[PDB]
Design a protein around this ligand. Structure first.
Ligand code: CL
Length: 332
């Protein structure tokens, strides 16, 4: 008798009800643009999976961002393309503008809309309490959309949230690790940064769903309101769960493991130990108290649950009192 199966609480069957081609990305045929339309201007950064450049589309003098892909299986490229195309036009989702291939090297490049990003290592030091609520709400719009479209981002973290603070514009980017949710499908648990991995990934529970993104969002929120980046700073996959357990407690952890009949890696037995569930007040100090409020802590608590089924959905999260003033302002 192995682990208890799990199904997404919401948006469970959205992909089943769509045509096969919506989610069957291995069959996707890429529509290629003209690489000569783009002249690279300057290098913007290096990623795990790509080199990122600023470019100009010389056919319309539009500034774009070009991610030249490092070698990866074509099906992973098809997946990212299919997901980006499925989500195009969705709220706060980065827009894929073109897909080109260098005719000599055969290296593919994804061409995106440009976003005048403010560096989060300089932005987060200036964000107000209202700013955090505002941008969290904007992230939730993107997550509710992609979840409703049958897609888990699986790499929610500050580096994948581009913010043009001057225009109060937000884009959730870097969909190369996202996947389609299918009920009963088992997924890879080692895909994104450990600091934002939900406990289900850390205990190798593979039948997870959209709620993994909600854990990651909670980790982001904690780091923003407490000014501690990353919040759960584990040394490895095992230590990561210890860091969580020292805050959320081991009792809720073992209850979760028992409920889903999860076989815990023998390493965890020694290192997890016994820990009380702590109060969030212990992370509040004079440098971050202007960002911490009862509503922030209530919201954070409802995201950071071991049991993925008990975390707020993106839509429930948007109804939380933490966002009341944001919702009122956006309505006028
Ligand atoms: Cl959701």
């Amino acid at each position: 008798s192995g682990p208890v199966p799990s199904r997404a609480r919401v948006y469970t069957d959205v992909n089943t009800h769509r045509p096969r081609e919506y989610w069957d990305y291995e069959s996707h045929v890429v529509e290629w643009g003209n690489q000569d339309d783009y002249q690279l201007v300057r290098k913007l950064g290096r990623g795990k999976y790509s080199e990122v450049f600023e470019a100009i589309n010389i056919t319309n003098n539009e500034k774009v961002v070009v991610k030249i892909l490092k070698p990866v299986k074509k099906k992973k490229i098809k997946r990212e393309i299919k997901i980006l195309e499925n989500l195009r036009g969705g709220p706060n989702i980065i827009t894929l503008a073109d897909i080109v291939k260098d005719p000599v090297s055969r290296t593919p490049a994804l061409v995106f809309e440009h976003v005048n990003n403010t560096d989060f290592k300089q932005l987060y030091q200036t964000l107000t309490d209202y700013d955090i609520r505002f941008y969290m709400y904007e992230i939730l719009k993107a997550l509710d959309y992609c979840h409703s479209m049958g897609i888990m981002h699986r790499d929610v973290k500050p580096h994948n949230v581009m913010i043009d603070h001057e225009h109060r514009k937000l884009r959730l980017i870097d969909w190369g690790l996202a996947e389609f949710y299918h009920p009963g499908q088992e997924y890879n648990v080692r895909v994104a940064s450990r600091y934002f991995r939900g406990p289900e990934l850390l205990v190798d529970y593979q039948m997870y769903d959209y709620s993994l993104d909600m854990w990651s969002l909670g980790c982001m929120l904690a780091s923003m309101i407490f000014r501690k980046e990353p919040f759960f700073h584990g040394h490895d996959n095992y230590d990561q769960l210890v860091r969580i357990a020292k805050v959320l407690g081991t009792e809720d952890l073992y209850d979760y493991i028992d409920k889903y009949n999860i076989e815990l890696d023998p390493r965890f037995n020694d290192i997890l130990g016994r820990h009380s569930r702590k109060r969030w007040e212990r992370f509040v100090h004079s440098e971050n108290q202007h960002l911490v409020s009862p509503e922030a802590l209530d919201f954070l608590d409802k995201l950071l649950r071991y049991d993925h089924q008990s975390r707020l959905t993106a839509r429930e999260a948007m109804e939380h009192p933490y966002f009341y003033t944001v919702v009122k302002d956006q309505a006028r």
